Amino acid sequence: GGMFGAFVSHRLWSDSGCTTTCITNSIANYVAFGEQIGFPFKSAQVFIAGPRKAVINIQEDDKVELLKMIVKHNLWVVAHGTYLDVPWSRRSAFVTHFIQQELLICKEVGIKGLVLHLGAVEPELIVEGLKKIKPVEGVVIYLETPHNKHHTYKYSTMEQIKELFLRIRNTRLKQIGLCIDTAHIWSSGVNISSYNDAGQWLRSLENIHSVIPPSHIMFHLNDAATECGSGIDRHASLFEGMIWKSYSHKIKQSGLYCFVEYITRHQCPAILERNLGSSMQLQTALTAEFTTLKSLLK
DNA sequence: GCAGCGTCC
DNA sequence: CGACGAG
DNA sequence: CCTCGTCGGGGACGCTG
Ligand SMILES: [Zn+2]
Ligand SMILES: [Zn+2]
Ligand SMILES: [Zn+2]
């Protein structure tokens, strides 16, 4: 089946006095929370650096314990890159080198990939900045669907996605994946509210498997507290935002349930990205989302 | 007409 | 979002 | 030991003078 999980923040999950092993400690509590509510988490997402500063956060003892934690529970963990990881920026010599550090760190601790945000630029400039990166065996760079309004390239329609990854394949750049953030393609103007709306988009995705195979596809399962076409990114819990709140009564006619079926049939990783002000709010929200997910799964 | 910000990811 | 200091 | 203020080597958004 699918590998379902959530983003694990340091502030809302780590114990006080976690000292040198705060990321692994947070994941430990996050795995405990999964067993309590009867949804064994198979995936997770963390920041090993930043995300707003070009500094590595994870420390040595954390790197050793994180590898043991990942192996023990067999977790599919992905690292989200910092917001400064723009390899196609003008002065990007300092930027690309920092991404090289993260990719090396990911392989040391057994993290499966690194998420980078696509820019609102041409695919030629995208592949150019990507070529400046030497691959790291076992770590996939997942290019995430961005969100904007006024720019030509949003990488949310299958035409723009197919164009990008074919230029990737012609350049012969290995270890590149796709991260589909549902809240972002919605913000970029892709109606995925109904089952058919998502099914048509997801069918066009499978129709270009020869350029981006589902083995290199991961998902951010996020509802959006914004209008379709906003360019503005406001995450919300599943069936509690503008995309799927109208389908809370019949969740198997929503667009999300079609995403769950594709994630299931391809064993893709799926990460919920929820931010709330405090631990208990976040846990109440995720318990609702993962029990609903368990309904669509089991 | 444009340059500089503040806010959010 | 997370490290780091003030208190 | 704590809590809380601060501030980021990018960028999209909308706003302001
Ligand atoms: Zn992201
Ligand atoms: Zn995302
Ligand atoms: Zn987002």
Residue numbers in the entry: -1 to 40, 41A, 42 to 296
Give sentences copied directly from the paper behind this entry.
ASFV AP endonuclease (AsfvAP) catalyzes DNA cleavage reaction at the abasic site and is a key enzyme of ASFV base excision repair (BER) system. AsfvAP belongs to the class II AP endonuclease family; it mainly catalyzes DNA cleavage reaction at the 5′ side of abasic site (AP), generating 3′-OH group and 5′-deoxyribose phosphate (dRP). AsfvAP is of α/β fold in nature; the β-strands form one β-barrel in the center, surrounded by α-helices at the outer side. AsfvAP possesses many unique structural features, including one narrower nucleotide-binding pocket at the active site, the C16–C20 disulfide bond-containing region, and histidine-rich loop.
AsfvAP/DNA-1 crystal belongs to P21 space group. Per asymmetric unit contains two AsfvAP/DNA-1 complexes, and each complex is formed by one AsfvAP protein and one DNA-1 molecule. However, as confirmed by the clear 2Fo–Fc electron density maps, the DNA was cleaved at the 5′ side of the abasic site in the structure. Three well-defined Zn2+ ions were captured in the structure, coordinating with the side chains of His78, His115, Glu142, Asp179, His182, Asp231, His233, and Glu271. In addition, the Zn2+ ions also forms direct coordination with the 5′-phosphate group of dRP, the product of the abasic site cleavage. Taken together, these observations demonstrated the catalytic activity of AsfvAP and indicated that the AsfvAP/DNA-1 complex was assembled in a catalytic form. The AsfvAP/DNA-1 complex structure was refined at atomic resolution (2.35 Å), which revealed the detailed basis for target DNA recognition by AsfvAP. The DNA molecule mainly interacts with AsfvAP in three regions: R1, R2, and R3. As revealed by our AsfvAP/DNA-1 complex, the S-S bond was formed between Cys16 and Cys20 within the R1 region.
